[PDB]
Amino acid sequence: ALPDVRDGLKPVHRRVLYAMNVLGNDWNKAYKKSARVVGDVIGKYHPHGDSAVYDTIVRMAQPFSLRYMLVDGQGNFGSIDGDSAAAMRYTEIRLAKIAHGLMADLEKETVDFVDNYDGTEKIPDVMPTKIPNLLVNGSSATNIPPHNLTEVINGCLAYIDNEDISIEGLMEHIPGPDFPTAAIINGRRGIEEAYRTGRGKVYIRARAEVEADAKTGRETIIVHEIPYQVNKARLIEKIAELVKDKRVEGISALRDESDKDGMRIVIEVKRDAVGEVVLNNLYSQTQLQVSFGINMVALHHGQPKIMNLKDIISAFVRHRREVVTRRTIFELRKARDRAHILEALAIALANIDPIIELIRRAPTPAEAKAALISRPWDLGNVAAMLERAGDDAARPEWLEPEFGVRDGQYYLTEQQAQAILDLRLQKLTGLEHEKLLDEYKELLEQIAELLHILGSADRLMEVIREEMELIRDQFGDERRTEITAEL
Amino acid sequence: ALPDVRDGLKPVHRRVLYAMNVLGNDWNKAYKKSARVVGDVIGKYHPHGDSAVYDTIVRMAQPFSLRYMLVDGQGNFGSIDGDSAAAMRYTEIRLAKIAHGLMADLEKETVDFVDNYDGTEKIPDVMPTKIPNLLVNGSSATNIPPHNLTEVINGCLAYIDNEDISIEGLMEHIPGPDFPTAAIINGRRGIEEAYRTGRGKVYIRARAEVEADAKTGRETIIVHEIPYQVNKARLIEKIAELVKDKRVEGISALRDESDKDGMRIVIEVKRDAVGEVVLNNLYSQTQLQVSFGINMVALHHGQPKIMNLKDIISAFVRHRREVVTRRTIFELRKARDRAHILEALAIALANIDPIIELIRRAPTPAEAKAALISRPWDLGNVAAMLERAGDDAARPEWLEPEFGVRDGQYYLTEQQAQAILDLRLQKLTGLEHEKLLDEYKELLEQIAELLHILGSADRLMEVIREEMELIRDQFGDERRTEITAEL
């Protein structure tokens, strides 16, 4: 019931997003019915007939709930007035583009997986996220508000450049929360306290203007934006209640003129009243102004912990160091496995005449294989490629020293012999031959760059910086919530 | 909500069995959790957070509900006392062996597929069943009772020997229903009325006997079997309710002694009472005897129809005629396309030396392909095998006449060239050489047998007969319900 500080998620979130990932439910592919995803989650991860899965999908798709939606939804997903989402057989979803950054390099042994309820499926323990999702989308015991992604990436970059940065140094890049529903924060004092201690109170206030008709002089209050997590219809019901009960005076009419092009609550003022006095009374009596108690609590390796702003940014960058290191180990083993195979193929294609002759002479493929490994092979015109002044970095770690280039010859493994046996005749054409050799030369350059990253903390942080700036370019947007230096 | 006359299934039944088929949830593989199958069905075919899917699975697995269970279930799936099955996260299922006979040859274009609820999946309109499942398992508006498989197969075979067979002739093989709970049917009048018109009333009566002690002289009523669809616990509660309200007399004790060795209900008779009178009293006031209204309605050519016994059997045999015809068409086209490829491979392995040189000097696979087709190839040592197929029958129905053998030379198509280019080196061995030669002979034998089936209605019915006798050998069992004159 508490989110992980590294990806900002709970198990139920991770089941939905992983299930969508394994189904190929990608941001640039056709929508699927919500019920398709719900059924995969029930069958594999949450085997109950409840509605919790669909409710999780629905919030993840609501622009009035998430500052950066993780689900791209199509259909009736509810409203700011409290309307319900349609049933799961009527709505359509797919991953949001930013959710792909949440699950980047999940296939590269970057995070631990755990077993599902029956031991036939795996599920990630945490996401390998490039997106600081805890700060950016928030969590609502814990009460972390959402933030602007550009500001947070810049704060992360500032921390990477100076681990001894202070809270005040981070607030030069992160002045405070940024809600999907915009509006106004009155005052900075509660923000500084919450970023310094993990706890503080801020005041959120609606964006509202007092108009006056050009001829008649009559005043109207127009409400453009309301505080985060406030239901518009309930708010208007309450104002009407106060007007009927005479607890708020000066109001002659009230109605919601909102449409799909913006919010517009109309509050008409009596002639004998003052629009600003009415508005100030509404702020004091209604959810046109609310307090938001910031309480930044999250799981730090399984343990609940109160965390200040620096703690949270520090944990996300530490997460990135681990994810990139593990990714680089995985790509290094995968590159060496493939280079190993390509050496066997290059050698077969340089000795093609005795290779074919050997195989034709064999009764069964199982003893053509045994003949290939019993005999060394000349390096031929590919010895420039394989010797390389004693360079043996492309060798798999598990390869015994009796295999590979030796004494000017090559000694195959059984799976290398199998690879040769699996070769299709197309591979003997000229362009396909060179294509295998070009892949091998790229792999040697790739392998050297992977070893550099593993051996230089400076280079690892260079890679992380680049990822951060790219995320800023793709998903950064403009601040919505105004922070005043008043009240 | 009507069953199809051909496979005995409603849409929800068919969706469950198709989903388990697609999952590989086979009779000879490990059990899967019920929830995993339920989730697949909800997502793809039946998108409601509902118990309809799991209730369907549960009934299919109950030996007291189905005369030949379609689901092999492990765990608590309920009992004849009416207690509920455990939740889907606690039970395990796989297809029963007979269920694979329901779905045999689904992949050979034997039945029409229709769209699912969202048009992203295909689902069969009906199953290509070798089992006459409507009669044999029944459906309880319609109300069809179950039947013995051995008897129904024999009736189908008698209809194949004489389509002019009468109801009375079919009843030499099928004397009446056969319930999984055994017991006794009283009177043959309603059976014949139902088999001739589609509607009739039969009376199901428990198997009960009065025994008397040798040393004490006491009488005990022992119930061994009870009517189909009667809850044993409700029945015992009713007998007790009648004894307390004095509506039945002569009972001094009542005790359910049922175990793993069978059902056993004990009713001790008072010495002032006569056992036979009390038992008769029970048959008249309890579910120790019930009526069963046979009302054989099913979907036939997409319309509801009342159907007598000959109508049903004729519809099944007609279904088998269409499925085998369509299967034979599919298998014949598949066999001609494999024979087409095999010819090309056989000529290449014979002229292997100029093939390797031709490909080595091509710079790209496309130019090796244009070089393979444009010149003819010598028939070599393989020319005897192609002439055995002197009948231009193994030839696909799309092939133009200029391709093939011509003046001692073979002229390859584009597909045939690709198959050569896709050839792996291990095919150049000896045992993998001849393996492909034998396969070509067997294909010619098989192609002839398929052509005979399509040409001769008599031979088509010979395949169906063998299939039916196989089903009888594999799954036929003994009759459980005794049929008596009347009482």
Domain-embedded: residue A372: yes
Domain-embedded: residue A476: no
What single letter denotes the amino acid at residue A442? E
Phi, psi (5° rounding) for residue A254?
-155, 125
Same domain? B250 vs B337: no
Chain B hits for A424, CB-CB cut-off 8 Å, are: 421-424
Q: End-to-end alpha-carbon separation of chain B, Å?
A: 36
Same domain? B283 vs B361: no
Same domain? B367 vs B276: no
A217 in contact with chain B, both atoms CB, cutoff 8 A: no
Cα–Cα distance between A440 and A446 in angstroms, integer? 10
From residue B479, alpha-carbon distances to A384, B151, B152, B289 in Å are 81, 9, 11, 20
DSSP run (H or E) holding B86: none
3-state secondary structure (DSSP) of residue A166: coil
Cα–Cα distance between A109 and A318 in angstroms, integer? 17
Examine the fold and report which residue of A257, A287, A317 is the final residue of a domain before the chain moves on. A287
Return the DSSP state at A380: G
Chain B hits for A118, CB-CB cut-off 8 Å, are: 33, 36
Phi, psi (5° rounding) for residue B24?
75, 30
Q: Is B109 left (phi over 0), alpha (psi -120 to 50) or beta?
A: left
Cα–Cα distance between B117 and B11 in angstroms, integer? 12
Neighbours of B371 (CB within 10 A): 14
Cα–Cα distance between A243 and A221 in angstroms, integer? 15
Closest by Cα among B294, B17, B41, B32 to B131: B17
Cα–Cα distance between A394 and A446 in angstroms, integer? 10
Chain B hits for A368, CB-CB cut-off 8 Å, are: 426, 429
Chain B hits for A54, CB-CB cut-off 8 Å, are: 49
Same domain? A335 vs A428: yes
Neighbours of B437 (CB within 10 A): 14
The runs of H, that is alpha helices, within B245-399 are 275-285, 309-350, 352-361, 365-374, 383-388
Same domain? B272 vs B368: no
Instruction: Give yes or no: B203 in active site.
Output: no
The H helix count followed by the E strand count for chain A is 17, 18
Domain-embedded: residue A174: no
CA dihedral B152, B158, B161, B162 (to 10 degrees): -120
3-state secondary structure (DSSP) of residue A128: coil
Cα–Cα distance between A174 and A169 in angstroms, integer? 9
Domain-embedded: residue A360: yes
Cα–Cα distance between A61 and A75 in angstroms, integer? 10
CATH value at residue A377:
1.10.268.10
Same domain? A350 vs A411: yes
Cα–Cα distance between A197 and A177 in angstroms, integer? 16
Is B486 exposed, middle or buried (CB count within 10 Å of its CB: 0-12, 13-18, 19+)? exposed
Number of domains present in the structure of chain A: 2
A42 and B35 within 8 Å at the Cβ level: the answer is: yes
CATH value at residue A221:
3.30.1360.40
Tokens of A345: 């193929």
Q: What is the resolution of this structure in A?
A: 2.4
Contact A275, A266 (CB under 8 A): no
Selected for mutation to probe chain B from A412, A414, A425 (highest B CB count within 10 Å) is: A425
Contact B66, B180 (CB under 8 A): yes
**DSSP codes of every residue in A213-255:** -TTT--EEEEEEE--TT--HHHHHHHHHHHHHTTSS-SEEEEE
Tokens of B299: 């979907």
Positive or negative CA dihedral for A138, A144, A145, A147?
negative
CA dihedral B32, B36, B38, B41 (to 10 degrees): -110
Same domain? A336 vs A450: yes
B117 in contact with chain A, both atoms CB, cutoff 8 A: yes
Q: Which domain holds residue A339?
A: 330-454
Tokens of B219: 């009488």
Q: At what angle do helices B34-44 and B52-60 cross, to 10 degrees?
A: 130
Q: Looking at CA atoms only, how far is residue B29 from chain A in angstroms?
A: 14
From residue B38, alpha-carbon distances to A39, B122, B127, B165, B390 in Å are 8, 18, 20, 44, 54
Tokens of A111: 């995070």
DSSP run (H or E) holding B403: none
Closest by Cα among B321, B2, B5 to B136: B5
3-state secondary structure (DSSP) of residue B197: helix
**Can you list the pairs that B267-273 forms with residues at least 24 positions away whose Cβ atoms lie under 8 Å?**
B267/B220, B267/B221, B267/B222, B267/B223, B267/B239, B268/B218, B268/B219, B268/B220, B268/B221, B269/B210, B269/B218, B269/B219, B269/B220, B269/B221, B271/B217, B271/B218, B273/B219, B273/B249
Cα–Cα distance between A52 and A344 in angstroms, integer? 53
Neighbours of B312 (CB within 10 A): 24
Domain-embedded: residue B276: yes
Selected for mutation to probe chain B from A46, A426, A431, A435 (highest B CB count within 10 Å) is: A426
Same domain? A375 vs A436: yes
Domain-embedded: residue B410: yes
* B59-78 burial code (b ≥16 CB/10 A, e <16): bbbbebbbbbbbbbbeeebb
B417 in contact with chain A, both atoms CB, cutoff 8 A: no
> Tokens 């015992």 belong to which residue?
B236
Domain-embedded: residue B178: no
Same domain? A450 vs A366: yes
Same domain? B358 vs B444: yes
Neighbours of B309 (CB within 10 A): 23
A389 in contact with chain B, both atoms CB, cutoff 8 A: no
Same domain? B431 vs B348: yes
The runs of H, that is alpha helices, within A305-409 are 309-350, 352-360, 365-374, 383-387
Domain-embedded: residue A280: yes
A426 and B365 within 8 Å at the Cβ level: the answer is: yes
Same domain? A341 vs A446: yes
Contact B315, B309 (CB under 8 A): no
Cα–Cα distance between A103 and B211 in angstroms, integer? 74
CA dihedral B23, B27, B29, B32 (to 10 degrees): 60
Phi, psi (5° rounding) for residue A181?
-95, 15
Contact A113, A14 (CB under 8 A): no
3-state secondary structure (DSSP) of residue A200: strand
Neighbours of A124 (CB within 10 A): 21
Cα–Cα distance between B228 and B235 in angstroms, integer? 13
Cα–Cα distance between B103 and B113 in angstroms, integer? 13
Tokens of B322: 């269409």
Beta bridge partners of B482: B184
